[PDB]
From a paper:
PSI-ACPIs were purified from Rhodomonas sp. NIES-2332 (Materials and Methods section), and its structure was solved by cryo-EM, which showed that it contained two supercomplexes, one with 14 ACPIs and another one with 11 ACPIs. The structures of PSI-14 ACPIs and PSI-11 ACPIs are solved at resolutions of 2.08 and 2.14 Å, respectively. In the PSI-14 ACPIs supercomplex, 14 ACPIs are named ACP-a to ACP-n, and another subunit ACPI-s is also found, whereas the PSI-11 ACPIs supercomplex lacks three ACPIs, namely, ACPI-e/f/g. As the PSI-11 ACPI structure has also been found in the previous study (Zhang et al., 2024a), we consider that this represents a form of PSI-ACPIs present in vivo, but we cannot exclude that a part of ACPIs have been released from PSI due to detergent solubilization during isolation, leading to the observation of the PSI-11 ACPI supercomplex. PsaQ is a hydrophilic subunit located at the lumenal side, with a four helices-bundle structure similar to that of PsbQ found in PSII. Interestingly, it binds a Chl a at the membrane surface (a302/Q), which is close to PsaB but without an amino acid residue as its ligand. On the other hand, PSI-ACPI purified from cells grown in the S-phase does not contain PsaQ (Zhang et al., 2024a), whereas our PSI-ACPI structure contains PsaQ, suggesting that our cells are in the L-phase.
Photosynthesis converts light energy into chemical energy by two photosystems, photosystem I (PSI) and photosystem II (PSII). Among them, PSII splits water and generates electrons, protons and molecular oxygen, whereas PSI transfers the electrons generated by PSII to nicotinamide adenine dinucleotide phosphate, producing reducing power to be utilized for the subsequent CO2 fixation. Both PSII and PSI are composed of a reaction center core associated with outside antenna proteins which function to harvest light energy and transfer them to the reaction center. Different from the red algal antennae, cryptophyte LHCs contain a unique carotenoid alloxanthin (Alx), as well as Chl a/c2, which are therefore termed ACP (alloxanthin and Chl a/c binding protein) (Zhao et al., 2023; Mao et al., 2024) or CAC (Chl a/c binding protein) (Kuthanová Trsková et al., 2019; Zhang et al., 2024a) instead of LHC.
Residue numbers in the entry:
A (entry chain A): 11 to 189, 192 to 754
B (entry chain L): 2 to 152
C (entry chain J): 1 to 42
D (entry chain F): 28 to 188
E (entry chain C): 2 to 81
F (entry chain D): 4 to 141
G (entry chain E): 2 to 61
H (entry chain I): 1 to 33
Amino acid sequence: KKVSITVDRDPVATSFEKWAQPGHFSRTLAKGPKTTTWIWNLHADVHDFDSHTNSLEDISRKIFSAHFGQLSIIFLWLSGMYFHGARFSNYSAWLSNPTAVKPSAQVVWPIVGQEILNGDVGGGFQGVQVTSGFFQIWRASGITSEVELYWCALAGLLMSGLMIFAGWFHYHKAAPKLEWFQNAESMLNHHLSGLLGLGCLSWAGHQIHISLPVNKLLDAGVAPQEIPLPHEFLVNRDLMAQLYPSFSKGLVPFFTLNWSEYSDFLTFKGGLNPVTGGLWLSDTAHHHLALAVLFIVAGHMYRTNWGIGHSMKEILEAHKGPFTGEGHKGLYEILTTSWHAQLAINLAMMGSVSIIVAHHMYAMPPYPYIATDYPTQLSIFTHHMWIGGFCVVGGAAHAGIFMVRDYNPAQNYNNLLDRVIRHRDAIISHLNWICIFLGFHSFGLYIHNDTMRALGRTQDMFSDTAIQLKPVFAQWVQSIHTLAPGNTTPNALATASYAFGGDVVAVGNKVAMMPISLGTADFMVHHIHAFTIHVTVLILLKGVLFSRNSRLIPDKANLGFRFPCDGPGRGGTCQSSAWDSVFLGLFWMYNCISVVIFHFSWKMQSDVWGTVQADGTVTHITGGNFAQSAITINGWLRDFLWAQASQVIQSYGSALSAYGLIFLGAHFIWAFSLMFLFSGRGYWQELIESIVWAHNKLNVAPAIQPRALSITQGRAVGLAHYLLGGIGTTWAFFLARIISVG
Amino acid sequence: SQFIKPYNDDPFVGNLATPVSTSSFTKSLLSNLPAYRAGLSPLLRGVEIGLTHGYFLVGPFYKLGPLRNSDVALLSGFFSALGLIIILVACLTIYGVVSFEETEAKDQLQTAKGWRQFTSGWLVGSVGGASFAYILISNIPFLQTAGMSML
Amino acid sequence: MDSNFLKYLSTAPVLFTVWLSFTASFIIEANRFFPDMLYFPM
Amino acid sequence: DVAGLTPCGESKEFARRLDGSVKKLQTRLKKYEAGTPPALALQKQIDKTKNRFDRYGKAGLLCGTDGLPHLIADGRWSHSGEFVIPGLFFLYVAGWIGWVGRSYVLFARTADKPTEKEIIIDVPVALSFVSTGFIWPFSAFKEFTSGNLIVPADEITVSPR
Amino acid sequence: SHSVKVYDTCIGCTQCVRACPCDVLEMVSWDGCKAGQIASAPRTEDCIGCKRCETACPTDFLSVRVYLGGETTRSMGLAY
Amino acid sequence: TLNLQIPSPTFEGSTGGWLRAAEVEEKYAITWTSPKEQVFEMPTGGAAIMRQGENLLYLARKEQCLALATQVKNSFKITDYKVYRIFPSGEVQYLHPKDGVFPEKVNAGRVGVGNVSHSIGKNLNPAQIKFTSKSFNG
Amino acid sequence: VKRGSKVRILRKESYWYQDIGTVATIDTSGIRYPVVVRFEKVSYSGVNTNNFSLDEVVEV
Amino acid sequence: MTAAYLPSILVPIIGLIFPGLVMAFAFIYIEQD
Ligand code: CLA
Ligand code: CLA
Ligand code: CLA
Ligand code: CLA
Ligand code: CLA
Ligand code: CLA
Ligand SMILES: CC1=C(C/C=C(\C)CCC[C@H](C)CCC[C@H](C)CCCC(C)C)C(=O)c2ccccc2C1=O
Ligand code: SF4
Ligand code: SF4
């Protein structure tokens, strides 16, 4: 049939011969080194499969097996986290007292005095405090003992072994053909209905059958050791039906569409659980069950061996209008022949999804006792923000790689891609103009407010006690969403999140969630965010659209995706490749995500996070300074950067001193990065000439001639150490501050 | 049915004929602007453009300037607008000095005499429009509070 | 021992990692059994 | 003593540093029950702190007014173990390392393809070389005096002046 | 305009002429090399200065040399 | 000579084409003959379809024309292309191939321009030729 | 100099100045640089052979 | 301050009239053929 299984048996013999021949994958590199450049080329282009061979089938097989290897590594990491939670953690003591026991799942050996890092985290335990949020996940899953964590680690190890065996089998023993990989409709049907749909259905099953009774017993105050085992919740229907009486009615209401009988364990309550500060687990169980139903329905859309189903090529070619020529014609061939286009799309979507995850997870805490765990919230927001930004820039990069390599103008005549290329100048000019407009009317407000406060004119500033820039649209949206329960969402007991408005949900005298008001400073920082995102879009889109040619270099596609320059001519053509545009866009992504996480940290510490005391007043961590200080750069410099760095620089002699060390070390490495960033290859090559003379004088010159790193490698090394330094500095500062004060 | 065509039936010039660029409305609006309208001396083009821009220049200076909360806010705003007008007239003067060689032709904007006439018209129109805006805001209380006088 | 596997084990990154870990283990065990050696003792 | 510094075994501020460290560890010890593994770990840390301060006080180290040991490195034998003798130990090892590396380079030039020897180490030959480094000063000096270490200037590449 | 010189170390491999994007160099008859040809630069007013010819030259330190000088519209690569 | 009446390849237009300096300072033209109607990539960005027979195209820079010539040479085996320079006054200056033979092939009558009769290491130091109009080559 | 001989380079601008190469061919015609010398070390451009005159090569 | 009118006279002149005329005349000089 048209969708079938085709496999070649034993295509590559399993041998250690090529393990002893570095550079075997590349005909240029298989000759062996002559310069040190060879080594860097060997480690830089190794998984760039399309540059080693022209056969798409072998490339796809390599991609499939490398994905299996990554899945094996991810399962090994998860098994490690479960095992280190099982053996080297305070998880039972945290289960007994969540509001007073700091989570810790890393213990150091005493060697050189580093045992001071095993801080007093409570529960009679000493270790390094962890902020990954695994304790709250395990509490949400119903894990009450470390034996279950040991079994989870064993399952993770078995799945890692299964994935690595599957990789070896599906590359080295039975490799699928190119026709097997080129089934987009079957892959979408199976991955929508089976991967997402059955996964959501089975997790809804686990939540309903295991998580809900155990968490209901935990919130009622039962100790974990007297809680029944999950299989007892499976087999004893009376034991479940004391907690959820609808289980006494069985599966008859499901098949007879009497679903409201199940309204006690499938709810749409919203808000947060007052005992734990997390989302109601019944709401999540209905949510994942509804997602399972929607995904399984969506997984029957696409045409297969049987006659039913949609054809995506027909869908794409049918959508065309008078403004767009041939429309979406030719994109199906692009996405079924070029892996780089798919990697671009999927990286862009995973980055946007990670950003959505960060926003929606701080605002609606889904796990018990994760809302008052302020380090966990800050850590997961910052981490997923950074992963999202990196994945978006990678989507742009691999879009540029598709544009340079796999784009064929003969198969792309007068379609959307051709017309986008044909008005690239209008796109880049209008985006450049709007970026300059955003830069002026966003950053000049901060500069203007700094000057006015410095000139002693407080009435001339942009503030709430001066000339106002009120965020009326976002406040109106907040009012609608606060008014949504009972008016536009009649079946909701509470709002989707209290950040739009409502009461102060507090757990253990610490604010789980409260309303987040928006003023002039929020207006200015959101338009700063819009400015930075538009400038990053300008850099990445300009690099993608001018990747093949420009008015400067008419044959840029012949030079490739990644080249340093086209010489000093035409005035200078330095950093003309799409790769250098990605190189600059990574810096601007760093700036954007840094400003976003700084806004997040300051706004939660000033207006949301804090302690509740008598008469219901909320004492915030920084005492509500965001409204009057975040309108100037001086306020950011003093009340956020200077003020909250006191914890990381006075951490010496305490358990957080490692963060201070890392703080200094990141400060070192970032500055070290500028040595690569500001300098050029010829200076270092001549200095290496002098060092080669010195080694020649003692007859100790190596056979592999040392060369300076390439111009592209100089840029990449400077960017990598720059990103590592900046992210590590923000990492140490954030973690030390939020562990100390929260 | 294609809505986007090569500009001027030349596919290799650096422009495209679009509904935003080359529709009947856009062509009528551009051909009826004083900078492109036929039958106008450069002096009258300058007069119309200066009247419009000098008229609208008064507003931001009056409403947002450092003297906006004082009784002389409109006078200060008009004087600041006049100073901006003088600066822009100096910009026009040096542009016309450096951009054109001295030719007999004086009926086009891109000639020395035509640009000097355009600069003269722009100055006179800018002063007249700024003075008209000053008169209107001085004599109408609705403009002094920008519409809060109705509340 | 397969000779190709031994030759792969003889590569610069593997031997570099093994030798630097071996050296680090010497320093770590020396500082574990003889800590706080600011000086050569007289 | 030297440079106005006092011996650490009679310095009152050295004792104040020791007392401050012991109290800082003991206040952490106070919050744990006796017999618990954190209590044993903290008591071991206290024992290491006391042993380190005792060992430092009886070693003839000189302490400044800060309360920390100060090293003397002018060449005097009364502090010869503070910089001179450990440095020679480094001088033993480092002169070893370069020499054996130099030896391997002289081996690697003689192979059929030198660069493969550069990236893929001949492990028995390298182990022979790292064994050879125990007599490196005399071997290196004999290599120097026989004209096999220094090469003349007319056989080395140089840039145009 | 940039200045392009060809020295008598040229071996007449024609690589620099093939690498030129602006048609600045051409091969002329010569007796100094075994190939019987030497590169020449009659059209240096079109030279942008990209030094692709210098990258293409296989003789140890280059036989073709580009010296950047006075910048013109052609040499600056301006389409405006 | 450049025939101005040669038909052009079918192109939908783009924003990458020639600016005002083409009609004011100088413009470039490339002609070539194709054995069939086929799609090529424009050097200014975009795809155009060249007709069977002769094709005339206008560009802003010589390098764009020679990039198109290299593209059609290595992708369509077309070597008969001719590149001309056109001024606003209407004078057409033939540019490539200058003597009809491609510059990588030796042709009789070509004279060497810029040839130096010694190696590059025999150039003079600046101190001989400071305050003097002598060239550094000798 | 002859075929197969090891020679040192006296050309100042050369990458292999005062280094040792092997003569690969001596051309007999009236060439300014008739001595092709092949080197074991590659240059910065990745080449390992060059032509030299008779006075730019000395037998070792 | 003796002759206190002189700062209020000269600072606007030196800071706005002098640079404007200098930029205008320098523009005219550097752009003329
Ligand atoms: C319903 C069937 C089904 C399912 C569940 C999957 C699942 C997956 N495919 Mg997939 N695929 C399918 C059919 C299916 N495929 C078909 C029919 C085709 C051919 C058109 C492909 C072609 C294809 C390609 C080309 C690629 C994938 C990849 C992936 C993985 C995405 C990464 C991820 O989220 O892992 C996390 C999700 C998990 C569920 C982790 C567990 C992993 C194992 C394998 C799940 C096994 C579940 C098992 C069937 C049921 C046992 C559960 C229980 C009863 C015990 C994921 C494991 C990508 C990949 O990484 O490949 C290695 C990839 O590149 N698929
Ligand atoms: C889904 C993820 C994914 C996948 C599968 C690929 C796959 C690929 N990319 Mg891509 N890319 C991605 C994400 C991804 N990328 C992202 C997110 C970015 C943005 C940063 C990029 C940016 C990017 C560029 C700019 C380029 C590629 C290239 C490539 C190709 C070759 C890569 C190679 O050989 O590297 C081999 C592996 C390495 C060199 C290892 C890199 C090690 C990093 C730099 C350091 C890690 C630091 C560590 C995390 C922290 C240590 C700190 C500690 C010491 C204290 C290959 C097709 C290149 C190419 O040739 O494409 C055709 C190319 O030019 N990609
Ligand atoms: C803080 C330092 C700084 C500043 C101010 C800028 C400013 C700018 N960069 Mg840049 N950049 C920087 C660091 C900086 N960059 C670094 C470190 C990198 C490293 C990779 C880059 C990489 C980079 C790229 C890759 C790109 C930019 C772009 C831009 C422009 C964006 C347009 C804009 O926002 O206009 C607003 C202007 C400002 C915010 C500057 C401050 C002006 C304020 C309003 C005060 C004005 C005062 C007034 C003029 C003074 C008059 C007094 C008189 C005497 C003169 C702008 C000129 C983009 C661009 O040009 O596209 C449009 C672009 O593509 N930059
Ligand atoms: C065989 C090892 C070896 C030896 C004997 C030398 C010898 C020398 N180097 Mg050199 N060097 C080497 C490797 C070596 N180099 C390597 C691998 C690098 C790259 C990191 C350098 C980078 C380097 C620089 C940048 C400089 C020197 C300088 C010098 C001179 C002064 C000594 C010095 O500063 O050492 C310091 C040595 C280092 C900082 C790097 C050493 C790296 C490791 C430790 C050595 C390699 C050991 C090797 C792996 C052993 C394998 C052998 C085994 C198989 C048997 C001297 C001629 C300096 C000079 O010109 O002074 C006149 C100078 O500025 N070297
Ligand atoms: C280089 C020396 C120098 C500097 C930096 C200043 C700086 C200043 N003077 Mg001052 N002044 C100077 C010399 C200087 N003075 C001398 C020598 C005299 C005596 C004639 C005066 C008489 C003077 C008066 C009467 C007043 C100032 C005022 C001021 C202030 C506003 C600027 C202004 O209106 O200038 C006006 C200055 C002048 C008209 C005199 C010209 C200054 C000297 C002669 C020229 C030096 C130029 C320099 C060497 C070359 C620069 C080349 C290039 C960098 C441009 C400012 C703090 C005003 C004030 O108090 O404001 C608070 C004010 O009213 N100055
Ligand atoms: C050292 C030079 C200098 C001086 C003397 C001033 C002086 C002044 N500035 Mg200022 N400014 C400067 C540099 C300077 N600025 C720079 C470098 C910037 C860029 C960052 C600014 C940006 C700036 C802003 C954004 C604003 C001022 C304003 C003001 C005024 C204060 C408010 C007031 O009472 O005026 C009331 C205003 C007036 C009385 C209007 C004065 C109009 C003048 C007299 C017309 C002259 C035109 C021209 C100079 C004629 C010659 C043309 C020739 C140069 C070609 C005051 C006149 C404020 C203001 O009121 O301006 C509207 C204001 O909003 N300045
Ligand atoms: C410093 C620097 C170099 C010099 C970097 C050298 C050539 C490479 C350094 C790599 C070392 C050898 C590996 C890691 C160093 C280890 C800490 C110790 C070396 C271990 C040896 C046994 C190899 C460049 O080549 C360069 C190129 C372009 C722009 C900027 C720069 C630049 O700033
Ligand atoms: S620099 Fe570029 S344009 Fe000039 S001669 Fe060399 S290759 Fe041709
Ligand atoms: S590339 Fe060098 S060697 Fe070859 S013809 Fe040109 S100048 Fe001569």
